[PDB]
Amino acid sequence: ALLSFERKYRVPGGTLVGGNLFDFWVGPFYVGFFGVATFFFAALGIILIAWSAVLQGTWNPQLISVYPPALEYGLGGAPLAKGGLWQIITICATGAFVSWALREVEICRKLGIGYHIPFAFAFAILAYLTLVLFRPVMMGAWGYAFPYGIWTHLDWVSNTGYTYGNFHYNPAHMIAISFFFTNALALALHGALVLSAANPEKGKEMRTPDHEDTFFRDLVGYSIGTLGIHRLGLLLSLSAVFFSALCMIITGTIWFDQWVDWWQWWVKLPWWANIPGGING
Amino acid sequence: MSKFYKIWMIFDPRRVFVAQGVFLFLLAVMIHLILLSTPSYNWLEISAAKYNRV
Amino acid sequence: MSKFYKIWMIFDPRRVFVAQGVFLFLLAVMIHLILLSTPSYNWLEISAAKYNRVA
Amino acid sequence: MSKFYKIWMIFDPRRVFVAQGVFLFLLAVMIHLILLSTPSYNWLEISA
Amino acid sequence: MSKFYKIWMIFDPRRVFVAQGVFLFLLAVMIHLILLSTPSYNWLEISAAKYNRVA
Amino acid sequence: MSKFYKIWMIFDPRRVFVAQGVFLFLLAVMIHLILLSTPSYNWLEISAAKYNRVA
Amino acid sequence: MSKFYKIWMIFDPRRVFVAQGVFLFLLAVMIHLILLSTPSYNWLEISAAKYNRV
Amino acid sequence: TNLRLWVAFQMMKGAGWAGGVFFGTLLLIGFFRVVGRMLPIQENQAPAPNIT
């Protein structure tokens, strides 16, 4: 169950909690203290989703939906059949996520690599906590969070999006969408470039990093470099998540009307708010 | 049945007890939450309706 | 069906027992949840109606 | 139960005690929140 | 057909058995779930109607 | 006709057999689901109507 | 016409056979699916009307 | 070097870390509760995004 080179890196230490109490491998996985919490919260969260399907009365996996408590319950406890289960799953999901990030931290220290990966994952968690915890708490109801369903958490997105008209006009959303599109553009370009330099035309030698820079300089006149593109990949993803977390935390808390109405401030600037012609007036 | 001690000749006790500890506590929490969800056997709810706590 | 012991020459005992433990637990959990879903064979609901715990 | 002491030759004692402290506190937190969730047994509300 | 044993000279027994084990379980699960879906052949619901469990 | 055996000089026996095994199963699953979807040839339902399982 | 065998000196037999096999199956699926779509040539419904299955 | 204190100190050490993490989480929840109360959410608040 070990790779041809895995043995020399399997050494004690690097644990945050427990020392050697949980410092062992189950197959390929490293357990650690936080992996035990990971497995428990993961298993408990999964079972309560399955049990929530029993209470709902359906077994179709797409119809399974763990709705959060209704708006009348506010930010308090709810009956397990009508919102209470969602709160337990959310606590289990929050515990599983943070334990997973901290388990990655232990693996980082054991290998001596940087903590970029758990720091990158923490951005996703704060994005997750924005939707289920930070936004509902500010709005004072767990019902503003999204249900744990495959196609019912899309209903939440559509309903929350159309609460404020066309959600595209959210300015933080436009920033994040540009980042998400840019990151996927960068990933396709970055993935394709290395494969082109590593799996070239038949018979020709494997290419060097200079050909990678030469290709993109002949293409768009600029090469960001092997270090730059991976920095770009990390920052593009985190910025997309950071602005996506920002876009929702200001919606329903600081902005309440249609987002298209927001953009009229630019049109209503003092020096051209009254000039005739164009689209607006 | 008298040869079941050989399971420890195969499975290290440290990993099993961790695995078993998680499994039992996961199982125990699972059953209690099942009973709480149902209107019956929700002992917190049963006493409230029995003693007119509402 | 006499030489079935040779399965352990093919399969590692440690991996199978973990796989079997996970398989049996998840299979057992699945069947219990299937029974609980149906109004009949949901023994939690059965006893409530049998002894009139609804009131 | 006369040989349960041998579990300390399996698991390191100080590591378990720290972990058990975490487990006991979180379990105590877990039960108290469930009681607050129910309309009854919510001591912070029935008093007022 | 006596040379069917030669399939093990081509197919690794370790990978086949795991694939066969997963395939047989998923195939067994799939047929059971198809049967449980139909109003008939759902043995849970048949007994409820036969023994008047739903009242 | 006779020289079809040379296809194994070109095709890897392992690659074909795995691909063939997947192809046959998916083709068999597809046709069975086609028959189940039609109101006729759905042998589960037609037998239910034959013996009046549901009425 | 008699020299069509030369085309195998240009085309790799393995890639042609795999490409041909996938194309023939996908084409076969497409036509068999098209016929099922139309009320005519839907041989499943054709037999149903003929033998009064419904 | 007291064994009873040493064991109790370890368990108190774990309980303290769990306590700080739980109290820190409540601090964030309380902070967002305060900010939401300060902002004019109650004056104009969105309808339910999902069916209750």
Place this chain on the structure above:
Amino acid sequence: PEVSEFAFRLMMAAVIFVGVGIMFAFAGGHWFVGLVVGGLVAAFFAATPNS
């Protein structure tokens, strides 16, 4: 307590941005005028750390 030149440069730029933004939001008839002037000066200040 060991801030680098770049760390201090950013901190002052944030202070300059807030300060100048308020300055020209009052002076101008709109908050955007403050944002532009405050942003440009802060960006120029933060992009030139002495070293």
Place this chain on the structure above:
Amino acid sequence: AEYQNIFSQVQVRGPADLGMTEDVNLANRSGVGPFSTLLGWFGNAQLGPIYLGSLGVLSLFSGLMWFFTIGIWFWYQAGWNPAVFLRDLFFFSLEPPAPEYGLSFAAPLKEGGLWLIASFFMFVAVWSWWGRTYLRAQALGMGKHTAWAFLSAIWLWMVLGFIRPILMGSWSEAVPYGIFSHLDWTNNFSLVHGNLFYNPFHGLSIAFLYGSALLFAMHGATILAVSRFGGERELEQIADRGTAAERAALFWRWTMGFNATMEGIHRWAIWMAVLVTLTGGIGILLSGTVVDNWYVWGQNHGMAPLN
């Protein structure tokens, strides 16, 4: 609070790298541009040279005329007023013809006829650029992965503006050329087709768009984590596996059970992003032509509670 390698803490500026010369016609290659210190903090500071061949010229001419045609219509919509032009820049739009004209080219020049001209220029511009990516890879003897990764993007781009309008038999179904208009076109697309969220293929594209962000955040952080072992030089790690490749392999093997290689991770990278638009093109293509309401389609396929 240590060096995280996010930004270079020192810059070195040697002579400009003129690049390789496998089969690239150096006459068509330009000279080296400036060195940007601001870009040097993140990546390379050198800009240029850029190759400009036959397809490069056709790409620029059509690309400029596409950009110019939108601009002239933007000025006409502004009344030639620079103040109005900047005020309504995002609200300007080069709308496609009205639904009455269908696919006919009889639309008036100010009522959709100009859009056909601008769209033609973009069509030539993009396709000529795709060949440019193909030929640049062929010139250096590299794989055509960029050419086919690009063709995934073209498939969605072709579907939105060209293929789907033809099937719908109307240029009005196409995309307007504007900042807010093509946002409004997007929103109106879902509403007309009944909650495009319940499009299975739109959901898949979001899976791979989320996954591309997931994989690049994972991959970018991984290499920066193992950059202390020289892991950013991925091509040498493919050739001669160093300790960075092994640790990067082991981190994900101990985290999620399975891992990849230094070369195989980029196969995940290319396919994760390609499926973003590949599934996207089918998802848009089906909408209207096959499914006139996805939520009703979702109900009949067990994706919505009703029916």
Place this chain on the structure above:
Amino acid sequence: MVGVTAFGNFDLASLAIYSFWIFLAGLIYYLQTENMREGYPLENEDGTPAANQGPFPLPKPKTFILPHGRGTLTVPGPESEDRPIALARTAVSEGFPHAPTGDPMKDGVGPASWVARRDLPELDGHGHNKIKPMKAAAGFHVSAGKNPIGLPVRGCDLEIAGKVVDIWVDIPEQMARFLEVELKDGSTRLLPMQMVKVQSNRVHVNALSSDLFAGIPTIKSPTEVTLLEEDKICGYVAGGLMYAAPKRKSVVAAMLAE
């Protein structure tokens, strides 16, 4: 074909979505097999092939023709560690850590591990050495940021153990890779630029303590560094994060200390 269903609810959209699941299942299989060209077949903790190899079979081998006549690389292929691993089994049962037999930083195990790469310098596209000192580099100079040359080098124990002398530069990428730190004994070690934090007045190396600076593996040639020497240097310094924790004076290091 609006509403045209071949059977049941199955229609052209249903045809496409299932056909993609087949394609995606096939694609995930293809991608996973490609990832199995390195580190496979699996091995036991002793070194023998394991009874378990995974559900995905090994792919057909492919050959990479290395640049500059370095040869070819066919994977999957027989891969060997080619170095004695100074680790000791801590439990007969598998999935348990291996403790170092001696000094792990010197033995190249754990976080301080390294791989037997080719003992040759890495080349650019033109055949020249990719990584060269800035002194031997033609025209290279510090363009921005604090110049680290001449700054004192402070270890994790807050003790100065030398000063920077030269910077090594990746000539194609035109970015610094190593700092050539001269110790108190007159010899110069190489420190990866990723493991140092050039502050206002000093080079703080959080990885290594002052006494451990002398232990960095040395380069055979002052004008070039091979791939093997890079791994030993990068491994040693990065191994210092866990193996010099007792010597680190940081508050968080004390909290995480054993």
Place this chain on the structure above:
Amino acid sequence: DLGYTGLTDEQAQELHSVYMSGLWLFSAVAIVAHLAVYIWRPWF
């Protein structure tokens, strides 16, 4: 004598004999459990 796992035939026989005893014990408890359910609530 493929010996992928390294077990000898004697070790396999002993491991299987204990494994089957565990299986028959598990099956025996299940058969009793099914009898209890079928008596209390038959599903046929």
Place this chain on the structure above:
Amino acid sequence: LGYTGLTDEQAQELHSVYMSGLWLFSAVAIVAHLAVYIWRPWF
């Protein structure tokens, strides 16, 4: 057969202590189940 390195006697001692814990755990469970069944039967 050796995987964990335990001798036959060490396993027998380990199993006996483990079984002692199992029956003690089972006994509390049986007492708990009787208490619940008396208080509220589920059959």
Place this chain on the structure above:
Amino acid sequence: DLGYTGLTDEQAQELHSVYMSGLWLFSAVAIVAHLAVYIWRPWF
């Protein structure tokens, strides 16, 4: 005598007696708290 933690048998016995004493003390206080609540609000 497995020696996974290195503690001798005597140290294990002494530590377990300490741990059990705290366990029963913790159990006793919890019983009192449960009695107090059941008096205040029974849950049966």
